[PDB]
């Protein structure tokens, strides 16, 4: 576990076995854990992608670390995922876990599918970022962003370092997940991967204005 160090606003990284006599740590107030989102890294942030990048395995214990600071998310998820018979898919979040409150859009998703036994984890190990908490598991009805966690030493300086989109899922990734974006309980639009949170809002407002069970964008 490397530690970033900020010197004259320049990142340096201090390795565990490398002695740096210029790293001045007067107190632990200079030590921070920072959550960053998988957004500024240039990847897709839509709902179909989120499904594809997630998977399950049983027998894998839960793991949690915290953080004090982090990035704002353009795209968060809040999932209330059920088995076809109504049984819960996702585990309950443990006490003290709160959904992440710093999202411009929240991809609130429900619907049904087979939900293979196990916990839902990220395919490349990204953390699910909950309010001030990072963990390896997706929890039920809890808002989170997806990202990574850095640790670092700050210099002693005075720098100080919404919209809900409702979707319905189709089988959680069984070689197809046709998501529909819900405009109303009686109005659904085919979700196309190039339709951003912003376009989904525009589509919702436009069809509502025009009187609305399934519709397509037809661009």
């Amino acid at each position, epitope marked *: 576990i490397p530690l970033g160090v900020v010197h004259n606003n320049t990142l340096q990284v201090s390795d565990i076995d490398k002695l740096v006599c210029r790293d001045k740590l007067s107190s632990t107030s200079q030590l921070k854990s920072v959550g960053l989102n998988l957004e500024g890294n240039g990847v897709a942030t839509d709902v179909p992608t989120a499904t594809k990048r997630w998977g399950f395995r049983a027998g894998v214990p839960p793991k949690v670390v915290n953080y004090e600071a982090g990035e704002w998310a353009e795209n968060c998820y809040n999932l209330d995922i059920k088995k076809a018979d109504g049984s819960e898919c996702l585990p309950e979040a443990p006490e003290g876990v709160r959904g992440f409150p710093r999202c411009r859009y929240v991809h609130k998703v429900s619907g049904t599918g087979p939900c293979p036994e196990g916990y839902a984890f990220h395919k490349e190990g990204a953390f699910f970022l909950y309010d001030r908490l990072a963990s390896t598991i997706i929890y039920r009805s809890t808002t989170f962003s997806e990202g990574v966690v850095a640790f670092l030493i700050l210099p002693e300086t005075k720098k100080d370092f919404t919209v809900t989109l409702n979707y319905v899922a*189709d*089988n959680f990734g069984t070689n197809m997940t046709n998501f529909l974006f819900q405009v109303d309980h009686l109005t659904y639009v085919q979700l196309e991967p190039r339709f951003t949170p912003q376009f989904l809002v525009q589509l919702n407002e436009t069809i509502y204005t025009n009187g609305r*069970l*399934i519709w397509k964008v037809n661009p």
Partner: antibody
Amino acid sequence: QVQLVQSGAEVKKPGSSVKVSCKASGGTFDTYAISWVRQAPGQGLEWMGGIIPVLGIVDYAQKFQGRVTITAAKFTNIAYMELSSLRSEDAAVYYCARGLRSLSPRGQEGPTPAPGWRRAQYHYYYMDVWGTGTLVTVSS
Amino acid sequence: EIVMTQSPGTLSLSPGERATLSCRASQSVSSNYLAWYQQKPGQAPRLLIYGASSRATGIPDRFSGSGSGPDFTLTISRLEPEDFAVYYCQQYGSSPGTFGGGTKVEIK
């Protein structure tokens, strides 16, 4: 093995609304398309819209627009057809059946796009499980 | 909706006799998805054939379908007393799917 069970025969007056119920009976109806028919005497099977309890959308038949509600409670085992404005033409044996026990894109078919206008899409598959039927006698 | 008819509409047959039933759609059926099913009065219908010719689950070899486009048939070999049913067709190759009026098989 699931065997769908329909309610028994009943006698109804014209103008009434008959809520026809079917039990999954060895299964549930959760996300499955439950199709219905009306076997009026001397006729074949008149098709009615499929019901999904845990629905996105459900279908409807054209001949029953404004006449039949297609509905079930989420994650239930009872499915219903609400036959409003009952007429003697509705004296029939009604049946419930399972066909496409997973509404998904293969189950989403319909008229093609007309840019500026949109179409809903729904489709059901081969009905493998048919339940018992209910004779609804309609007075006139 | 979609129009479908059936023919001859009546078949007076001896038990053990081989006979062919026909169904006609007003339109071609995509992927030849025509179903055949049968019921005797008082019974719920049971799927015999799906996909024009393929046998449905639990269906004996005596039932074999065929056809293409709008034109389909069902051949029943060794007709048993249990098979003197009214046979019906349904189109799953279009939407909304549709049903024919039935073909009656009866004992001679």
